[PDB]
């Protein structure tokens, strides 16, 4: 009883290296040693385990970062809209309101980032790129006012997306950039939310994405490349937006993700024979809701009506025990430093693991104190489902540009 990771038999889930040591096994055993110490610390210190999400610490870390960042974030100077999205999403998940004037200041900042030729860049005067375009549009939707919606130039945005579209179905990340399954997701996310999808915008795109699924079951960044959770999320989520989820072998995909949850740590790895992280609480585990909605759309009557097809409890235990910084913020794994990215995706993953939804059926699992329960997140867009519905509704008022 009652925390899965502290049960005596859990010790049997440690790595079996068959007496054959390689780089891979040495590195996995190091991680498992650190994590076991975390799991054990309660017993060694003779205290009852109590899992608490340090909301107030996280809130103050976020509140501050929304305004000001140390020079440690110099590496993210071409990604400032990412920071707006990470932090705003984290606040939304923690159920912390956004002052009308931080809202207006974010709006103004993102307008400075918008390019006269469409899309958003990483900061004022930077050229546009699909990653900061995605982040900007998501941030604006989280804010959700008429001001925030009005920032986006839908006409230019559509021009920009066409400028990136390739003959084989793919998109460039930016002009003169290269192509990637990330770009298809960024394009489909922004297009669908703002209602600018034309009949030919995504012609070939599902087939290009389907070419990225490999012998493993997952999706690589381009055809031929190793399966990875980041790319598998982008690929599946884009196909859900395009209604082409059917193009994939969903069954090999399901077997692949589920295989990515670590038996000992409880969190997810990004690819096979690599390390648990942190942000894959969202990128890997967020596949399960998408696979549920897909397999259900095909009439799969073996589907649970209460749980996603991963160990929700073990993931919550990983995040809560191993991924919180005491000063606020969340992280990849013990011994790493906090950051706003892991704060975003660790909390997004926590939320997914807490909330099951499937039409009529709703069911929560909240490990630790009941205060730990977060607001839900939409598995396709990773903003609140209310922000999505809301946003999709307001831009349906307008015609797809051209019309």
């Amino acid at each position: 009883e009652p925390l899965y990771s502290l049960r005596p038999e859990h010790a049997r889930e440690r790595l079996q290296d068959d007496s054959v040591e390689t780089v891979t096994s040495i590195e996995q055993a190091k991680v498992e040693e650190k994590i076991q110490e975390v799991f054990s610390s309660y017993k060694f210190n003779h205290l009852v385990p109590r899992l608490v999400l340090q909301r107030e610490k996280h809130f103050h870390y976020l509140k501050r970062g929304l305004r000001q960042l140390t020079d440690a974030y110099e590496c993210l100077d071409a990604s400032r809209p990412w920071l707006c999205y990470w932090i705003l999403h984290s606040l939304e998940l923690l159920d912390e309101p956004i002052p009308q004037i931080v809202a207006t200041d974010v709006c103004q900042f993102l307008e400075l980032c918008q390019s006269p030729d469409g899309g958003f860049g990483g900061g004022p005067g930077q050229y546009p790129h699909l990653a900061p375009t995605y982040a900007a549009v998501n941030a604006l939707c989280i804010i959700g006012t008429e001001e925030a919606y009005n920032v986006i130039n839908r006409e230019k945005l559509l021009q920009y997306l066409y400028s990136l579209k390739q003959p084989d179905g793919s998109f460039l990340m930016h002009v003169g950039g290269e192509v990637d399954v990330r770009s298809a997701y960024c394009a489909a996310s922004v297009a669908s939310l703002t209602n600018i999808i034309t009949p030919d915008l995504f012609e070939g795109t599902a087939e290009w994405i389907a070419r990225c699924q490999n012998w493993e079951g997952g999706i690589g960044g381009v055809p031929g490349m190793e399966a990875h959770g980041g790319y598998t999320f982008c690929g599946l989520a884009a196909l859900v937006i395009l209604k082409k989820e059917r193009s994939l072998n969903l069954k090999s995909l399901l077997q692949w993700v589920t295989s990515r949850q670590m038996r000992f740590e409880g969190g997810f790895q990004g690819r096979c024979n690599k390390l648990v992280d942190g942000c894959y609480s969202f990128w890997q585990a967020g596949l399960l809701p998408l696979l549920h909605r897909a397999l259900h759309a095909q009439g799969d009557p073996a589907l649970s009506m209460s749980h996603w097809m991963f160990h929700q409890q073990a993931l919550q235990e990983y995040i809560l025990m191993c991924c919180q910084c005491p000063a606020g913020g969340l992280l990849d794994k013990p011994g790493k430093s906090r950051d706003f990215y892991h704060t975003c995706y660790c909390l997004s993953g926590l939320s997914i693991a807490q909330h099951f939804g499937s039409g009529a059926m709703l069911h929560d699992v909240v490990m630790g104190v009941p205060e730990n329960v977060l607001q839900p997140t939409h598995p396709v867009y990773n903003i609140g489902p209310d922000k999505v519905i809301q946003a999709t509704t307001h831009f349906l008022q307008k015609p797809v540009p051209g019309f």
Binding site: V20, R80, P124, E216, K274
Partner: protein, 315 residues
């Protein structure tokens, strides 16, 4: 020329060669958000980069400035784009630029911009001759670097350099048989050369994997490879496979072996196999062995597999 970590580095604002140009400070608004408190050095380089960018100054001094800007934030895609404009306008020698990107990737190997720049150089030069060896040096430091594998695949495909790659694979597999990137490269090489729809290759591949599985039974990579190359023909098409796995249980058992058994049974049942309602119970016995005892992190998947099989292969 003047390195950013030279003891004698001077800010651009104190350089005489730059006096004619007024820096352009970042326009962040009256009340900024996510405002990063840049070091003096970063802010100084970038104020001058904005100036040359806005004037579209296509000069040797601008070219050298992009170097410092890149070093300060190599993720800055706007600087890389301008550097490429400058490489072309100034007619810079691209082999020297190849020397530069080599040094940069070597320092910051997990960055998209850096590998994309290299690829652009190789396509400008139509010259892949340094690539496999350079890539092998990066992989000697991190054998799982995703960009390095992606660039390798690209070079091999584009310039048809397939002939020595399976040998490279073999080397790395011996170094670390758990390296999933190397198992993936194996599949990539074989399926683009001889293919797997061939009996001589399909076999040797299987015998090699079973041989790897035997040496280290809890390496999931070899198991996923094995499954991967047999499964789209259908596992039940190979009837000896069952037996040969149902023979190393007490010797080499794992949740991987047991789960492979379930995949075999699953395909058997999907085709109208012999002893139908019979092989089904074997599978369920295993599923619940997995969901309750042997692989409980997947309890929700294995209970769902128990179900769907029940649902379509029972009564």
């Amino acid at each position: 020329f003047l390195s950013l970590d030279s003891p004698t580095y001077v800010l651009y604002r104190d350089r005489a060669e730059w006096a004619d140009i007024d820096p352009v400070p970042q326009n962040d608004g009256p009340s900024p958000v996510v405002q990063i408190i840049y070091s003096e050095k970063f802010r100084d380089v970038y104020d001058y980069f904005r100036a040359v960018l806005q004037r579209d100054e296509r000069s040797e001094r601008a070219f050298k400035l992009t170097r410092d800007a890149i070093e300060l934030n190599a993720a800055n895609y706007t600087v890389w784009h301008f550097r490429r404009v400058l490489l072309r306008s100034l007619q810079k020698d691209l082999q020297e630029e190849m020397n530069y990107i080599i040094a940069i990737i070597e320092e910051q190997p997990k960055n998209y911009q850096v590998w994309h720049h290299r690829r652009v150089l190789v396509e400008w030069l139509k010259d892949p001759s340094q690539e496999l060896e350079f890539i092998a040096d990066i992989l000697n430091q991190d054998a799982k670097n995703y960009h390095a594998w992606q660039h390798r695949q690209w070079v091999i495909q584009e310039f048809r350099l397939w002939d020595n790659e399976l040998q490279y694979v073999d080397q790395l597999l011996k170094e670390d048989v758990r390296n999933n990137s190397v198992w993936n490269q194996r599949h990539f090489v074989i399926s683009n050369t001889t293919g797997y729809s061939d009996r001589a290759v399909l076999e040797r591949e299987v015998q090699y994997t079973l041989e790897m599985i035997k040496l280290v039974p809890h390496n999931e990579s070899a198991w996923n490879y094995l499954k991967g190359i047999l499964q789209d023909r259908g596992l039940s098409r190979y009837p000896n496979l069952l037996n040969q796995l149902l023979d190393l249980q007490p010797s080499h058992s794992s949740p991987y072996l047991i789960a492979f058994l379930v995949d075999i049974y699953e395909d058997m049942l999907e085709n109208q196999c012999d002893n139908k309602e019979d092989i089904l119970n074997k599978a369920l016995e295993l599923c619940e062995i997995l969901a309750k005892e042997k692989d409980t992190i997947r309890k929700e998947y294995w209970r769902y597999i128990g179900r769907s099989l029940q649902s379509k292969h029972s009564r």
